[PDB]
Amino acid sequence: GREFGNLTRMRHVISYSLSPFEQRAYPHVFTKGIPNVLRRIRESFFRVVPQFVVFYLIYTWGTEEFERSKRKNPAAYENDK
Amino acid sequence: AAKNAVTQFVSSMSASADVLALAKIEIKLSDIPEGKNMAFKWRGKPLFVRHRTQKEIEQEAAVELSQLRDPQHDLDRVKKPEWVILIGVCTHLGCVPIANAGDFGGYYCPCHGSHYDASGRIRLGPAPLNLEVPTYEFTSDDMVIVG
Amino acid sequence: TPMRKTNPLMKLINHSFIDLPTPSNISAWWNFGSLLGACLILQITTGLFLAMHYSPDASTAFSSIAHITRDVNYGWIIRYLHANGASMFFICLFLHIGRGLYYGSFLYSETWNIGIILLLATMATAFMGYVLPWGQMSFWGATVITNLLSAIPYIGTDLVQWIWGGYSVDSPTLTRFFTFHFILPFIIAALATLHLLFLHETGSNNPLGITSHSDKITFHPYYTIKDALGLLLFLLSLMTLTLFSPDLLGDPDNYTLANPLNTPPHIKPEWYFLFAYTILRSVPNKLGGVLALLLSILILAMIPILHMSKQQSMMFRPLSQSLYWLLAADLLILTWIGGQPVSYPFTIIGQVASVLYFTTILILMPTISLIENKMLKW
Amino acid sequence: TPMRKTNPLMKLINHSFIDLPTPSNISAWWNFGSLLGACLILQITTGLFLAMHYSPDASTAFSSIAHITRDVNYGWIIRYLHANGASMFFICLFLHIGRGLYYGSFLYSETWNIGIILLLATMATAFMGYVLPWGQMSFWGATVITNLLSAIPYIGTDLVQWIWGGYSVDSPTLTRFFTFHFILPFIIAALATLHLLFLHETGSNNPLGITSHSDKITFHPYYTIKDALGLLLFLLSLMTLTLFSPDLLGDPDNYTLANPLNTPPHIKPEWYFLFAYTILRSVPNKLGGVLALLLSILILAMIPILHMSKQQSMMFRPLSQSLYWLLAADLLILTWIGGQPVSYPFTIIGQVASVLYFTTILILMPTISLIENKMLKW
Amino acid sequence: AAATLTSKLYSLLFRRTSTFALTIIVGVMFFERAFDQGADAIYDHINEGKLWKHIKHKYENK
Amino acid sequence: SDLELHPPSYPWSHRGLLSSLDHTSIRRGFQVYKQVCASCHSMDFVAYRHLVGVCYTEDEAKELAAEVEVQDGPNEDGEMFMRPGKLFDYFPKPYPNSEAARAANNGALPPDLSYIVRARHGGEDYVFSLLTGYCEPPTGVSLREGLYFNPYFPGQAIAMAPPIYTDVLEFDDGTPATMSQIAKDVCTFLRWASEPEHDHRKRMGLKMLMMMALLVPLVYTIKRHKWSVLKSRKLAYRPPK
Amino acid sequence: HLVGVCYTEDEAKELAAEVEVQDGPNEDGEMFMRPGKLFDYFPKPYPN
Amino acid sequence: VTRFLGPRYRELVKNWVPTAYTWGAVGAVGLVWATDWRLILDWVPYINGKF
Ligand code: HEM
Ligand code: HEM
Ligand code: HEM
Ligand code: HEM
Ligand code: FES
């Protein structure tokens, strides 16, 4: 059906490609690799993190408040006097 | 790593630490007196062991090869004739023979009168073939592996 | 004429594996689906060996487990690769659904629905399987979750007794669950074949969301080794999780033998069902939490209908992305809440997290899809 | 533009069932093949409800079946439908293979071989399943069959103990056999899917043996109701075997508990294995009896190679037909001999019947086929 | 202009896939033993005085 | 009432990611188990084997198994004679049944110790502190004389009497018999009792870390080697116009 | 079993009482005899 | 069957002989390692972690 012999038509778009053995498996890793990952992280960062940061505040609060809810047993007896 | 996977799963099927433990083991003292029998549990089967006098070895060896209901040369059976070690189950309907009893000096089955010689071969009674002889070997002079 | 194209069996291997076109630009997430298949292959065989030793009775089951962990050779490795392999199966599964929610793979609606059916079958499978250990947690987990069926108004108890096979959880029930838990995964494999069958006639989606017929690629040379890298990383996480800290993800106080007479102090479902548990515990009235429990998983079918964006991929729609990660954080909220004892601070956050969980997938998303439609002048 | 042609699931159903051409002149014998397809379902469904009570421990396997036949409501009908159902399964199986041997259907060699492998699978399934009840014949049959493995010259006993899980047949062996018995039939189903897969690219054979392309007809209108009638007659014969004479295809002694100590007299394996068992009885040597046993079933693979006639069906070649019914009578001879204690009359007839069983299809058939060739002047 | 070792190594072992799989299998043959005894030596080294096989000295060989 | 005190973490030898259990402590802890523990605690799942490869030698295990008689199946008639004992025998039941154990302990049932460590939250850390700690009862709270106040117990009133004190038992090793050393050896032995596979698991964890660290970069390089044709390609567009 | 084939349930409840079997342990006790009920199986003549 | 023998088929089988012995070595050594066969492994100079 949708085999390679019959898909989308396209017209003169030339392309170029080296043999795997003709080139290094790790081209310019430091000069270009790491900064790319850093740019990518800088793009995703503000989109992703803050909700999780919001989650943490709630997580901390919930445990802490529950601590006030229970561990502050003495507040109730203190209320008794 | 693949082998360390594959054979490992196979190792799960080969046995178990308890089944290996319950079975084979039956180390026992050679302290047993001649003509005196002692039963022992082994893989669920009863298993009598009895040291025997040389004269009994003589009357057992004297038995004709053809006369037996289930013929089997005696010296070819037991490794050392003075000791006899046998499964405690009679070959007929599975009742356990009384130790050191019967006309022939071996074992006798209460259930239906089956007789046995000191070598444990069937000699009279309904039971077809001879009492089973487990594979075993002596280690230290006082001890014996059973299995 | 290669031998693969003439042989009727090889044609299936040729189309389904070696030569089906895939988008060039596929990322790491698309690996997870394949991983699921592998996980299943692992959940079967490993578990199959456990079947060689486990004895499904009310008395002998736990002792058979001690038999597996000790007397059986290498049995504990099997039990832990299995029990942790299930949790890995749900990690890969939740991520696998999540990418579908993100990249708009849900537009393949039939494949989507079949995937949902695989999800429910997986839940019944893991649930019936967790009862097998017959530990303290198992008897009461099955007790409570089967007591949920009590809620249905007319069928109610009669249905529950029909599952129990008696007036309470006991040996026949444990044998029931042994059989069903033994049989379901093999159904899951066939439905997975249907899943790929509705998938491959249209082709795999790409992260951009634009049709990628211009740059299709044969699956073999590239994605066999890419997926192999995924299998290796998966075995990394699983083997580390089992061989270093096997029980961190497990539940202590499960090891005590089940007491009908005694109820454990905290009693919680294992974590992968557990978020849904909040939707139970937060909602008032016994039946409404059941209906909410159904809607919680069944919305996913409703989601494709709710699509309003003229695009597809989430990556070009940041305002939706904010709601998406907000929703994921909400899921973490549901999990941490479900990991905790009843109290007002927890119950309030559970109410808010539940209602927010439904509003984000019903109300909020379509509207900002419209707003994004208008920001780009459509 | 019918919808069957559009949706892929409806496409595959449109192929395998509703629309695929078949020869019009197909008779009642081909129906047995479809019947096998039915039987498997029964053997699953019915069996699935026996696994819900059965306990694979050696100490309780028997009492659990007593629990099924007595305590469980409507359990005995499931028990007997299952047990007689396996027998009907092998009857339809033997008739099916005889059909394939008679009409020259073996020329579809790949389908033939998949049929052979599936045959061995069903045999192992029936064996381990017969071992499950844990009676006298069950336990003893297991000991006798398992020892044969011991026959192999070097590996032998280590491998045999590897099947036993111990020195002797016991509970772990029973549990293992319960697992493999549980798992094998579904593999038999996938093989069956392969079987039909290879089958359909050429099309079903017709009794005349001439190609039927001139007279192909859709499967749905006709063979669905023909197979409905055949399935109805199948359920008829099965229900008559179960509700009137449940026992006669079976063997008393299984209702006694297994005794490792005591040994049962007649020691006869259930009837479908009997002929093969006679071959073990026939060759005095152990390993020789084992190889003759494996040859007894493998031998089917060599049939296409041994074919010499320039025609398929025996119906136009009466001499070979007479050899065929000699072969069937010989199988009845072995099948009857398997039920009998060794004695002068039986041992001689068993050996002659076995040697005749090998010589008639390794020698006489090709030669008389050549004679039939020369008689027809080509 | 000195030849690299790989220039001869490929010319011998790697040129045919059968010899390639063979040298792989022999490589597994040595690597299993070496790596296993090595990892065992390391794990034995981190925890001296703990493992019972080293504690056997209080009662071994009469 | 109020939730039980949360036990402090301890600098145990085996809590290191690669470090193993010290078998001498397992021995001394078993020697604690045989007296103070065994009188009123079952271990259903441990045989007199298991010890054979971890501490006691097989011959010493044979000598040890015979030191307590065990129930056996019938001889002639029923009569049920008792064997001297063997390696495959499990640790003896303190009581014939649980109800007797309750009768001997004011209704309280002493839990099986075979998995007591991995059952309780905080694991064995719950155990040592449970033994080490017996504060005198707080002012303003009162409880039955049969009950004893151990704060780390969730009910904060354990039925168990303080099992150990200094020189309750004399170690064969000749090491001093402080109750701290005793409780330490007990927790070590129980920890082994619940995880027999620990020492092997750490060993296989090391070996898998080495093989995995060896393999990941390699497979990654193979993937880079295949995908490099795609990453390095440079398509261009050349319209006739 | 017998309740549907011959004896009426009251008759089976009377007949079951005529023979007695040991029960589960008493508090600070063990193995006391019990009159027996419908769910009891037919008595076993020997302990083993 | 008779057709398979011939002047060029001898040449072909001879061409594939080294490959045949080499894969035979592959299957043999692979079997010896997969099975931990003790008999030959006692003879190998370094692979003696077996006791
Ligand atoms: C056992 C469970 C599952 C298995 C084995 C499985 C398998 C697969 C596989 C192999 C793919 C190919 C693409 C990829 O690997 O990413 C895929 C695609 C897909 N699956 Fe799943 N899946 C499972 C569960 C699910 C679930 C739970 C859902 C939805 C809730 C789902 C919905 C989808 C969708 C929408 C696609 C299309 C992806 C694309 O077009 O790129 N699947 N599935
Ligand atoms: C997707 C498929 C499956 C999943 C997710 C799954 C999950 C589980 C889980 C969570 C447990 C509980 C174990 C524990 O908590 O310790 C379990 C136990 C078990 N499973 Fe599965 N299972 C699956 C398929 C299978 C299959 C296919 C088999 C057999 C062929 C099987 C056999 C068993 C057995 C015998 C146990 C009991 C062992 C134990 O409880 O430790 N399971 N499974
Ligand atoms: C072609 C498929 C199958 C065949 C021919 C077959 C045949 C048999 C046979 C001959 C027995 C012996 C029963 C007796 O003689 O009393 C048996 C028992 C049994 N079968 Fe199957 N079986 C099949 C598939 C299955 C499946 C799919 C299951 C799934 C649960 C199953 C479950 C059982 C169980 C649990 C027993 C023993 C329980 C009892 O006998 O009461 N079998 N089967
Ligand atoms: C459970 C077992 C089996 C099932 C479900 C099955 C299924 C089928 C089905 C549905 C057909 C369609 C045509 C027909 O029904 O006549 C068929 C045909 C066929 N079967 Fe089977 N089969 C089984 C066992 C076997 C065995 C054991 C053999 C050979 C030893 C075999 C060889 C064949 C051959 C050669 C055909 C081609 C029919 C023709 O050419 O007209 N099958 N099978
Ligand atoms: S039972 Fe042995 S003689 Fe009757």
PDB file of C-alpha atoms and ligand atoms in Angstrom, chain C residues 40 43-44 47-48 50-51 54 65 79 82-83 86 89-90 125-126 129-130 132-133 178 181-182 185-186 188 272, ligand 2:
ATOM      1  CA  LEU C  40       5.571  -8.006  28.338  1.00  0.00           C
ATOM      2  CA  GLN C  43       6.729 -10.225  32.423  1.00  0.00           C
ATOM      3  CA  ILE C  44       5.643 -13.477  30.843  1.00  0.00           C
ATOM      4  CA  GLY C  47       6.588 -14.899  35.734  1.00  0.00           C
ATOM      5  CA  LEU C  48       6.202 -18.235  34.025  1.00  0.00           C
ATOM      6  CA  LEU C  50       7.307 -18.397  39.257  1.00  0.00           C
ATOM      7  CA  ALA C  51       4.310 -20.420  38.149  1.00  0.00           C
ATOM      8  CA  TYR C  54       3.891 -20.959  43.339  1.00  0.00           C
ATOM      9  CA  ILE C  65       6.890 -17.746  48.127  1.00  0.00           C
ATOM     10  CA  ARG C  79      10.637 -12.738  41.918  1.00  0.00           C
ATOM     11  CA  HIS C  82       9.127  -9.810  38.020  1.00  0.00           C
ATOM     12  CA  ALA C  83       7.687  -7.622  40.772  1.00  0.00           C
ATOM     13  CA  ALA C  86       5.720  -4.733  36.538  1.00  0.00           C
ATOM     14  CA  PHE C  89       6.029  -1.748  32.819  1.00  0.00           C
ATOM     15  CA  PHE C  90       3.864   1.002  34.313  1.00  0.00           C
ATOM     16  CA  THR C 125      -3.804  -7.942  35.303  1.00  0.00           C
ATOM     17  CA  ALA C 126      -1.500  -6.210  37.771  1.00  0.00           C
ATOM     18  CA  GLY C 129      -1.494 -10.399  40.325  1.00  0.00           C
ATOM     19  CA  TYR C 130      -0.790  -8.341  43.439  1.00  0.00           C
ATOM     20  CA  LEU C 132      -1.129 -13.663  44.668  1.00  0.00           C
ATOM     21  CA  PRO C 133       1.526 -13.069  47.346  1.00  0.00           C
ATOM     22  CA  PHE C 178      -4.157 -17.007  39.834  1.00  0.00           C
ATOM     23  CA  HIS C 181      -3.775 -13.167  36.160  1.00  0.00           C
ATOM     24  CA  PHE C 182      -2.231 -16.103  34.340  1.00  0.00           C
ATOM     25  CA  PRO C 185      -1.391 -10.994  29.496  1.00  0.00           C
ATOM     26  CA  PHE C 186      -1.727 -13.428  26.605  1.00  0.00           C
ATOM     27  CA  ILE C 188      -2.903  -8.339  25.970  1.00  0.00           C
ATOM     28  CA  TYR C 272       0.660   2.750  40.039  1.00  0.00           C
TER      29      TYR C 272
HETATM   30  C1  HEM I   2       1.845  -7.574  31.892  1.00  0.00           C
HETATM   31  C2  HEM I   2       1.861  -8.782  32.463  1.00  0.00           C
HETATM   32  C3  HEM I   2       2.044  -9.037  33.981  1.00  0.00           C
HETATM   33  C4  HEM I   2       2.178  -8.168  34.995  1.00  0.00           C
HETATM   34  C5  HEM I   2       2.185  -6.624  34.968  1.00  0.00           C
HETATM   35  C6  HEM I   2       2.324  -8.934  36.212  1.00  0.00           C
HETATM   36  C7  HEM I   2       2.487  -8.414  37.469  1.00  0.00           C
HETATM   37  C8  HEM I   2       2.648  -9.154  38.614  1.00  0.00           C
HETATM   38  C9  HEM I   2       2.751  -8.606  39.943  1.00  0.00           C
HETATM   39  C10 HEM I   2       2.701  -7.108  40.301  1.00  0.00           C
HETATM   40  C11 HEM I   2       2.898  -9.612  40.798  1.00  0.00           C
HETATM   41  C12 HEM I   2       3.054  -9.456  42.326  1.00  0.00           C
HETATM   42  C13 HEM I   2       4.426  -9.963  42.756  1.00  0.00           C
HETATM   43  C14 HEM I   2       4.811  -9.357  44.078  1.00  0.00           C
HETATM   44  O1  HEM I   2       4.208  -8.328  44.470  1.00  0.00           O
HETATM   45  O2  HEM I   2       5.725  -9.907  44.742  1.00  0.00           O
HETATM   46  C15 HEM I   2       2.898 -10.846  40.038  1.00  0.00           C
HETATM   47  C16 HEM I   2       3.024 -12.114  40.556  1.00  0.00           C
HETATM   48  C17 HEM I   2       2.992 -13.303  39.866  1.00  0.00           C
HETATM   49  N1  HEM I   2       2.827 -13.453  38.493  1.00  0.00           N
HETATM   50 FE1  HEM I   2       2.560 -11.874  37.189  1.00  0.00          FE
HETATM   51  N2  HEM I   2       2.278 -10.273  35.906  1.00  0.00           N
HETATM   52  C18 HEM I   2       2.106 -10.368  34.544  1.00  0.00           C
HETATM   53  C19 HEM I   2       2.010 -11.540  33.837  1.00  0.00           C
HETATM   54  C20 HEM I   2       2.215 -12.806  34.329  1.00  0.00           C
HETATM   55  C21 HEM I   2       2.340 -13.993  33.520  1.00  0.00           C
HETATM   56  C22 HEM I   2       2.245 -13.971  31.979  1.00  0.00           C
HETATM   57  C23 HEM I   2       2.525 -15.037  34.342  1.00  0.00           C
HETATM   58  C24 HEM I   2       2.726 -16.536  34.003  1.00  0.00           C
HETATM   59  C25 HEM I   2       2.906 -17.029  32.770  1.00  0.00           C
HETATM   60  C26 HEM I   2       2.532 -14.528  35.698  1.00  0.00           C
HETATM   61  C27 HEM I   2       2.700 -15.279  36.841  1.00  0.00           C
HETATM   62  C28 HEM I   2       2.838 -14.794  38.125  1.00  0.00           C
HETATM   63  C29 HEM I   2       3.023 -15.598  39.313  1.00  0.00           C
HETATM   64  C30 HEM I   2       3.102 -17.134  39.403  1.00  0.00           C
HETATM   65  C31 HEM I   2       3.127 -14.604  40.472  1.00  0.00           C
HETATM   66  C32 HEM I   2       3.322 -14.922  41.969  1.00  0.00           C
HETATM   67  C33 HEM I   2       4.779 -14.702  42.358  1.00  0.00           C
HETATM   68  C34 HEM I   2       4.847 -13.606  43.384  1.00  0.00           C
HETATM   69  O3  HEM I   2       3.765 -13.149  43.827  1.00  0.00           O
HETATM   70  O4  HEM I   2       5.971 -13.186  43.752  1.00  0.00           O
HETATM   71  N3  HEM I   2       2.337 -13.164  35.655  1.00  0.00           N
HETATM   72  N4  HEM I   2       2.741 -10.528  38.704  1.00  0.00           N
END
